[PDB]
Amino acid sequence: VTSIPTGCNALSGKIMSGFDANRFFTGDWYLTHSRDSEVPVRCEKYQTGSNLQLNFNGKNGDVKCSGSTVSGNQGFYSFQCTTTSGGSFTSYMAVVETDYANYALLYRCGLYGSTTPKDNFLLFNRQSSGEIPAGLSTKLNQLELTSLNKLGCS
Numbered sequence: 001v002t003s004i005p006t007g008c009n010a011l012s013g014k015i016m017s018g019f020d021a022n023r024f025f026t027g028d029w030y031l032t033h034s035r036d037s038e039v040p041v042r043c044e045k046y047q048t049g050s051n052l053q054l055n056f057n058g059k060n061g062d063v064k065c066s067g068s069t070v071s072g073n074q075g076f077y078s079f080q081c082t083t084t085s086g087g088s089f090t091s092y093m094a095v096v097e098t099d100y101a102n103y104a105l106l107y108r109c110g111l112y113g114s115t116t117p118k119d120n121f122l123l124f125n126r127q128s129s130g131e132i133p134a135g136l137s138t139k140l141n142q143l144e145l146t147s148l149n150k151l152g153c154s
Ligand SMILES: CCCCC/C=C\C\C=C/C=C/C=C/C[C@@H](O)CCCC(=O)O
Pocket: 029, 034, 046, 048, 054, 065, 079, 081, 091, 092, 093, 106, 108, 109, 118, 119, 120
C-alpha cells in the first residue's frame, strides 16, 4: 500500500512544516479531545516505543500497533494493530500540528472493513489534564474544529 485509502483527506497544504518523528514518537500521549466522539468517553493513553511501535488501552483491551511511513503521502503513517480480543486492523494518521512537549493535533482515517472511510481529528496532550492549547486557536478555526469534544481524561 503506497497511499492512504480513497476518501481519506491527504490534507495537502494543511500539515505543519518540518515534522520531526524522532521527537513525536517518544513518551506517552493522552487522547483528551476529538472532533467526533463515542459514548461513554474514555481516557486512552498511547504509549510509544522505538521503531514506531505503540500500545494503548482500547475500547475492549490493550491494542498493539506497528507503524510505517506512507510513501505517496507526506506526513502520513500506516499502523497495523492487533487487539487482545484477537482482532486486527489498519489505521492511517498524520500529525497536523505539534509542539512535541505539550500537545499534538492529529488526523486519523481508515476503512476498517468498509468502503466508506471513517476519520477524525484528535487532540493529544502530554498530561491527562491537558486541554485546548492557545497555540492552536487559529489552526482550529481554519479547520473548522471550533467545538472539539472533551473525552474521559482529567
Ligand atoms: C501517538 C500517536 C497515536 C496515533 C496512532 C494512530 C492510529 C493507530 C492507533 C489507533 C487507531 C484506532 C482507530 C480506531 C477508530 C475508530 O474507533 C474511530 C474512527 C474515528 C477515529 O479515528 O477516531
